Amino acid sequence: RRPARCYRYCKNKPYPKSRFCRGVPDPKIRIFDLGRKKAKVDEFPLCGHMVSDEYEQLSSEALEAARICANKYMVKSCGKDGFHIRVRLHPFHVNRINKMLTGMRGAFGKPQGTVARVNIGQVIMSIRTKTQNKEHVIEALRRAKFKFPGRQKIHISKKFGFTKFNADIFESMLAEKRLIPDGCGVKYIPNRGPLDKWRAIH
Amino acid sequence: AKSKNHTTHNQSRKWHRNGIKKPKSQRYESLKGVDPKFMRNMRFAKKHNKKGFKKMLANNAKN
RNA sequence: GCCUACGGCCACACCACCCUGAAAGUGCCUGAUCUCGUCUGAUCUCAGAAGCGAUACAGGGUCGGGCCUGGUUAGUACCUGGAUGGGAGACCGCCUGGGAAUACCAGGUGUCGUAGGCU
RNA sequence: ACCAUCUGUGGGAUUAUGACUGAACGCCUCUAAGUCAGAAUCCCCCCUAAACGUGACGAUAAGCGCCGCGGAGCCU
RNA sequence: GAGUUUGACUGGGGCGGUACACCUGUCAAACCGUAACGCAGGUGUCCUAAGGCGAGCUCAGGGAGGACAGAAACCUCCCGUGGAGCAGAAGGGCAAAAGCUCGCUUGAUCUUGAUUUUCAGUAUGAAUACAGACCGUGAAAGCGGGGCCUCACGAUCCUUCUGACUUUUUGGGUUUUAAGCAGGAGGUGUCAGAAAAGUUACCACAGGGAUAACUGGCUUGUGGCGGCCAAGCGUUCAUAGCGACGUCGCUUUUUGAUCCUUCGAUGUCGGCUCUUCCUAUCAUUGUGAAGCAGAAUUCACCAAGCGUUGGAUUGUUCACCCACUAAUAGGGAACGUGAGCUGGGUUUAGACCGUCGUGAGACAGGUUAGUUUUACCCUACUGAUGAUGUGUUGUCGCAAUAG
RNA sequence: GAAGGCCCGAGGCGGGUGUUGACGCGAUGUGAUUUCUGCCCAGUGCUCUGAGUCAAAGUGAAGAAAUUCAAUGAAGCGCGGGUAAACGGCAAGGUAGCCAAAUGCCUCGUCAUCUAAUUAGUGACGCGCAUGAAUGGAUGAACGAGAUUCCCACUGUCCCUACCUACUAUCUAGCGAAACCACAGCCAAGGGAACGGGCUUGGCGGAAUCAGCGGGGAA
RNA sequence: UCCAAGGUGAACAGCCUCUGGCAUGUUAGAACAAUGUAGGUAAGGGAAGUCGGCAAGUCAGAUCCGUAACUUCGGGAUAAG
RNA sequence: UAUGCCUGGGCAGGGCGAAGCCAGAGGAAACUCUGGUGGAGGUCCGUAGCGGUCCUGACGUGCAAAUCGGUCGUCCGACCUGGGUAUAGGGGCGAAAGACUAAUCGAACCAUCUAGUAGCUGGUUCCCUCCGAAGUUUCCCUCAGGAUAGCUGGCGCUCGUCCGUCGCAGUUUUAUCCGGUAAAGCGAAUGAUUAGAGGUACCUAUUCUCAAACUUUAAAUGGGUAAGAAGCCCGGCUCGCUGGCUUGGAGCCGGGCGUGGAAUGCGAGCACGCCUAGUGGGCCACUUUUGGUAAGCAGAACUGGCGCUGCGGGAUGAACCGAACGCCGGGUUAAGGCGCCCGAUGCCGACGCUCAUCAGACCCCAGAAAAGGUGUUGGUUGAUAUAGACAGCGCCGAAUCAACUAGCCCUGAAAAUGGAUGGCGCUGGAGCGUCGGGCCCAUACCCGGCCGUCGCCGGCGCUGGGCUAGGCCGCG
Ligand SMILES: [Mg+2]
Ligand SMILES: [Mg+2]
Ligand SMILES: [Mg+2]
Ligand SMILES: [Mg+2]
Ligand SMILES: [Mg+2]
Ligand SMILES: [Mg+2]
Ligand SMILES: [Mg+2]
Ligand SMILES: [Mg+2]
Ligand SMILES: [Mg+2]
Ligand SMILES: [Mg+2]
Ligand SMILES: [Mg+2]
Ligand SMILES: [Mg+2]
Ligand SMILES: [Mg+2]
Ligand SMILES: [Mg+2]
Ligand SMILES: [Mg+2]
Ligand SMILES: [Mg+2]
Ligand SMILES: [Mg+2]
Ligand SMILES: [Mg+2]
Ligand SMILES: [Mg+2]
Ligand SMILES: [Mg+2]
Ligand SMILES: [Mg+2]
Ligand SMILES: [Mg+2]
Ligand SMILES: [Mg+2]
Ligand SMILES: [Mg+2]
Ligand SMILES: [Mg+2]
Ligand SMILES: [Mg+2]
Ligand SMILES: [Mg+2]
Ligand SMILES: [Mg+2]
Ligand SMILES: [Mg+2]
Ligand SMILES: [Mg+2]
Ligand SMILES: [Mg+2]
Ligand SMILES: [Mg+2]
Ligand SMILES: [Mg+2]
Ligand SMILES: [Mg+2]
Ligand SMILES: [Mg+2]
Ligand SMILES: [Mg+2]
Ligand SMILES: [Mg+2]
Ligand SMILES: [Mg+2]
Ligand SMILES: [Mg+2]
Ligand SMILES: [Mg+2]
Ligand SMILES: [Mg+2]
Ligand SMILES: [Mg+2]
Ligand SMILES: [Mg+2]
Ligand SMILES: [Mg+2]
Ligand SMILES: [Mg+2]
Ligand SMILES: [Mg+2]
Ligand SMILES: [Mg+2]
Ligand SMILES: [Mg+2]
Ligand SMILES: [Mg+2]
Ligand SMILES: [Mg+2]
Ligand SMILES: [Mg+2]
Ligand SMILES: [Mg+2]
Ligand SMILES: [Mg+2]
Ligand SMILES: [Mg+2]
Ligand SMILES: [Mg+2]
Ligand SMILES: [Mg+2]
Ligand SMILES: [Mg+2]
Ligand SMILES: [Mg+2]
Ligand SMILES: [Mg+2]
Ligand SMILES: [Mg+2]
């Protein structure tokens, strides 16, 4: 295919696979969660993200290659069931390609591939694991940067795993029955529902 | 031998060259498109308006 | 305090469930001779007043759903105008002004007019 | 007429690189200061040309050159 | 045989398409408007009701049920904001409606003017709100002069039909006929509306760089070339030599895209000849590295000084093969080089064959024969006189600088 | 078969073939000889027959008449037959032959031969893009300023140039044009209508000329 | 269009001469550079040149011999050697 | 010249050698063979003649508007040629090349129609003053062109022209509406989509990522209207419309009331009158935006600009920055500059950063990336250490180490004539960043002179000069 230099910038409007854009091939990346996904929230407290710094288009080919490069290092350094990689960029923007060139007469091209439009400060790939595996996530996410264009920086989030709550408050909300784990994440329990649900918790 | 299709580039300058002019507001605007039944009775109100000219002079004297 | 007929605004009025309801009213309820309409007096139209508050209806309740209002998100995102600003670029900062929306949190939950009527 | 015959050349700084001494950085280190070797490359010699560049020197016609602050004047 | 015609748009033209008359969503950047051979679709119809009105009714789907009967037949109940339907594309609108069903109907009728939209604010088409008639419907209020709204259509001339009247039919009168007024229809889809097949290399003219083919210029998809990351290969060992999945560049010796320069003309392919240049070094010089014992070879560095040949076939560049060789490296210079050549190719007119066309002819299909013009002008370069100012003149030298 | 075929002609008792008469004249195709000349009459065209369409004139009918209507109704068309050494195709499905050809796109087909080496040549192979039988197929002695391949011989075509001669060029006397020409004439780079000679920044630049030269003047 | 000498030779070929005619073709002198046009030679190799034996060269007259493949029986044929 | 006809002329020397004939042979016969003779033919070599192959030779402003040389075809035949005749332009003639028909032929020549037409090229002649464009809308067998609207100019005309009042506006303010773009949302509808969990493949509660032809929400900018006398207030009249009823509605009449009822600027009106030229190829930039890998690409929105425009600056250059222009003097600046070219720092400028064996040197703008560096300088977050670490061989005796990040430099970084921060050159800066003071000059700004135009409800008929009033004078 063409090099990623041709479809790196978000130059057109988002062109998703819809009833009007038919004939789109299947994306290269199909699995977004790797490792031990069916793990409790207390299993993997630490989480690290691959935050982007460019407003560009990451190809599904680069999303799959960076997924394998990060998985092959977490398996070799943290075991096959000691992490959970979640790719947080689904390729929805379809790329078009013109015919193998009467030159520009009817130049609207046919679908070529799919990219994921990333924003400045948006997470690309997230890895949660034990706290002592902090340096392994930084290196696993660093090796996957070379499989991506542009500039990305590795950030260790203050949240507890893949949840949206800080690690400092997570322990307190668990004791107060405000957070209950449901598989990979937790459910926020407000005080604004029927009281029967409150009796079931306690 | 293609050419340009549509352009409104220099048209705002041409429009404001002499200024966008609104029609001069005239008292007693034109009564075109009004209800014909309404126009019939309004013509009869003005046709027989002089019939009460004597009562108008009498009532003005009371003031 | 409450109930009718007609309404205006059209969920703060809706929905689920539970509790309670004087008096009148409303409804249920009782019949098919006539009016009228159905496969069938269930509906509809008509005739009526033995029975009760079951339901409708109204009021109240729910750490109720929704809805409504406000806070928060946030001067965040976005944006007018400006620069011989930065950067290879992608884009970003500043100047001049303008300025959001979810999640989250809190509060509220019909109201008004006309006419007649009951405590 | 390689179809006969003859001739075709020396250095300099250095590139790459390998090193010396030696810190930074108690050690180490070709490098940071300072040194060495270093090439069909580069510059130069050799070689061809000789500048609105030139040196030495010879001879320089009734004309002509030096020597009298020639001794006075006219044009630039 | 004569005359004429053989649309336009168009990333040249033709072929294709209709972006040529219309409609929906979007593009369109929150009034409207807004382009491209932008995107996704629709249209030349359909309807005596699918028009109009009134009345009743409620849909899609789901749950629970009920002989045959089942995942889908029909009956019943409950939930059901419409998730159904409304002729069609789409959007909007719509629930005791605009849907479904039923019974009465023909406002889809006869008229005048105004208004909206496309707009020049012209026409047509399609709409809006009245008014005057005559009706439909409902108990009535009302509603209705077509379809819930946004598309579903046509000038002059001519023909035809209907209607009206102190209308004409020419010196009067009568009856035919013809003409006129007014309203429909017969149609121009190139849809504001000529009556229209080619071919031309035997071609001609007006022009056009508004516009193609050849160079240059922008671009680098493609081509070529080079990094980065390290799965893996290398018996073992990621990086001696390699580099999958990815990714970042460079080049203008491929091709494409574009159409800016040139159509009162820049001679256009290759070869021959000849000079200089580039390095992304094949060989030679000096090195580093190895999965370097030697030999041979591979990788890399300084590096373009020097060299890179002779032939068969082909017009060919490009390939292929024969040998030779230290090696037989890659390119630019208007794809260097036609007032340097050579015309083989291509590229007029002759002719053959195949396919194609009824034909004339066409064919980047093959084949054969086919005029290659001018320098004495200016620079450049090659040499040849001479010019330069120190008096003239001559000999013997120096030497910048260039090679 | 002449009252004709063919053709000329504005026109006639016009004229040509024709001073002719089928062993003739006129119109075409193929192209000596030898050897064969296959299939298709649907389409187009020609030609030959006797059972819907069919002009003017004529006849009939209605009407005051104009007019209208009706019947009749030529050739030609339509219908039918024949015809391909007619156009053509292979309605018939390419027969005999021939071929990678002057005809084969793929293609520099495959094989053999020809050479150290062959996109060439020849002989073969043929589902042949798209050969083929008087749109003639196949062959073929002799012939050809025809295209092509090889061999012998020969040769400065070449390796690799050299030398000689004649006329030019050259110089002089006499004589003496033309094309061409905005101004003109040393370059590099930059920008520019994207290849300057002139502008920009640099390199720099010395009278007047001779013989050459073919880079440039997009001569 | 007409007339057409001698020699050589098969020849009205080519070459030389006689009769007759002419002054080198709209100029001369000097020089002998390049490059041309025309003519010629070249050792050794012999088409390696080139799209291609282009151009050039080889062969040539006559006499005596010798003459195939193929053929339409005529030829090929001046085969070739 | 093409062809037919008529009447004439001309065509060496040789080669092979056909029918007929003669003779001699062979044979049982039929018949065959040999020698000679003969001199046939769209025969062969070849001269003249007639042709014109190759050299793609010479020449190619030539000898020549088709020739010359060598070579070459044919040369008893469908041969060559003179003369006389025949055929004439849409015709002739053609052994066929669209050949030839007087240097002219895929339709000759001559004169006329004819100054044929051209939406197409070229050109279009004195000065000055003043104003000044358009490449866009609709329609067109249109798309190199017209018609039309717009933009332009001319000619005016109706008024106003101290405050005041009318009237006006590419602008704010106030009041009130409109919209569905950015953003957001999809634990909300439609559509797309990830992972578990719970209850029993679904189902509930969560979770990841999205929309241009999705949306509950929803800006900024933006669009419309209004901000008074054409009003307000009081009292009556008309009507055939409206109707329970002066009940509406609209029109008219009389009287009363400026604090003109937001800010600012400004003279307006006449369907912005009447006639009207040119244009209807545009192009470029910020932002927005479509196709395209991209383009000095194609196509839009908005505004400015170029075209129509010079000037200062960017070396240079249609568009960038500044600023637009009568002719001058003085002054001051803009953008940009101040080592020298080249006007200005010849300041005892300030603080740091940086060494580059391809340093770097500033809008548009005219070559760089990913990835690296134990070059150097900052910063961030950690970790060891005087119960003695780091490094080096218990000794040593003071801090040290790791990761990450950011400046400059460096690697990555290869093109062809010799060359481009503009050049020279610059390294205690003439480099990069942050600033200060001073200084340099544009046709810009200020003041002054002169010229012209334009505007003054301009002045003067009341004379030393004056008033050609179509003159003179004054002001901006
Ligand atoms: Mg245009
Ligand atoms: Mg168009
Ligand atoms: Mg609630
Ligand atoms: Mg809120
Ligand atoms: Mg070193
Ligand atoms: Mg040394
Ligand atoms: Mg014609
Ligand atoms: Mg066209
Ligand atoms: Mg809009
Ligand atoms: Mg009506
Ligand atoms: Mg152009
Ligand atoms: Mg590539
Ligand atoms: Mg790869
Ligand atoms: Mg190199
Ligand atoms: Mg060769
Ligand atoms: Mg070339
Ligand atoms: Mg040339
Ligand atoms: Mg030439
Ligand atoms: Mg050439
Ligand atoms: Mg040729
Ligand atoms: Mg030809
Ligand atoms: Mg035939
Ligand atoms: Mg037939
Ligand atoms: Mg066959
Ligand atoms: Mg050969
Ligand atoms: Mg063959
Ligand atoms: Mg046949
Ligand atoms: Mg021949
Ligand atoms: Mg020039
Ligand atoms: Mg030329
Ligand atoms: Mg002579
Ligand atoms: Mg020789
Ligand atoms: Mg050869
Ligand atoms: Mg020859
Ligand atoms: Mg032979
Ligand atoms: Mg012969
Ligand atoms: Mg001859
Ligand atoms: Mg000749
Ligand atoms: Mg020639
Ligand atoms: Mg010449
Ligand atoms: Mg011959
Ligand atoms: Mg004659
Ligand atoms: Mg004539
Ligand atoms: Mg022809
Ligand atoms: Mg002026
Ligand atoms: Mg304009
Ligand atoms: Mg033009
Ligand atoms: Mg105009
Ligand atoms: Mg016009
Ligand atoms: Mg034009
Ligand atoms: Mg553009
Ligand atoms: Mg263009
Ligand atoms: Mg112009
Ligand atoms: Mg202007
Ligand atoms: Mg510049
Ligand atoms: Mg001044
Ligand atoms: Mg300067
Ligand atoms: Mg590296
Ligand atoms: Mg660098
Ligand atoms: Mg002034």
The 3-state secondary structure of chain A, one letter per residue: CCCHHHCCECCCCCCCCCCCCCCCCCCCCCCCECCCCCCCCCCCCEEEEEEECCCEEEEHHHHHHHHHHHHHHHHHHHCCCCEEEEECCCCCEEEEECCCCCCCCCCCCEEEEEEEECCCCCEEEEEEECHHHHHHHHHHHHHCCCCCCCCEEEEECCECCCCCCEHHHHHHHHHCCCEEEECCEEEECCCCCCHHHHHHHC
Q: Is the CB of A28 under 7 A from strand E?
A: yes
Q: Among A110, A97, A93, A109, which residue's Cα sits nearest to residue A55? A: A93
- Other beta carbons within 10 angstroms of residue A50's beta carbon come to 27
Q: How far is CA A43 from CA A13, A33, A47, A78, A184, in A?
A: 41, 16, 11, 13, 9
Residues in chain B: 63
Q: Which helix (H) or strand (E) holds B38?
A: helix B36-47
Handedness of CA A76, A80, A84, A88 (dihedral sign): positive
Give the integer Cα–Cα distance in Å for A162 and A127. 8
Distance B2 CA to E179 C1' (A): 54
Per DSSP, B18 falls in state: S
Question: Pairing relation of β-strands A152-156 and A46-52?
Answer: antiparallel
- Cβ–Cβ < 8 Å for A144, A34: no
Q: Is the CB of B10 under 7 A from strand E?
A: no
Distance B52 CA to H199 C1' (A): 92
Give the integer Cα–Cα distance in Å for A18 and A88. 21
Give the Å distance between the CA of A84 and the centre of ligand 17.
74
Q: Which helix (H) or strand (E) holds B45?
A: helix B36-47
Give the Å distance between the CA of B3 and the centre of ligand 50.
11
- Which nucleotide, over all strands, has the C1' atom closest to the CA of A13? H212
Give the integer Cα–Cα distance in Å for A133 and B34. 86
- Cβ–Cβ < 8 Å for A41, A159: no
Resolution in A: 2.4
CA atoms within 13 A on the CB side of A188: 7
Per DSSP, B50 falls in state: G
Vertex B52: Cα angle to B49 and B55 (nearest 5): 150
Q: Is the CB of A151 under 7 A from strand C?
A: yes
Vertex A63: Cα angle to A59 and A65 (nearest 5): 115
Q: Among A13, A107, A20, A109, which residue's Cα sits nearest to residue A57? A: A13
Method for this entry: cryo-EM
Distance A75 CA to H28 C1' (A): 127
Per DSSP, B2 falls in state: -
Q: Cβ neighbours of residue A202 under 8 Å, at least 6 residues apart?
A: A177
Distance A171 CA to E401 C1' (A): 90
Give the Å distance between the CA of A47 and the centre of ligand 38.
101
- For chain A, the straight-line distance linking the first and the last C-alpha, in angstroms and rounded, comes to 59
Give the Å distance between the CA of A30 and the centre of ligand 26.
61
- Please list the residues that pair with A154 across neighbouring strands: A50
Distance A102 CA to H40 C1' (A): 76
Q: Is the CB of B5 under 7 A from strand E?
A: yes
Give the integer Cα–Cα distance in Å for A43 and A184. 9
Give the Å distance between the CA of A127 and the centre of ligand 32.
89
Q: Is the CB of A73 under 7 A from strand E?
A: yes
Vertex A108: Cα angle to A105 and A114 (nearest 5): 155
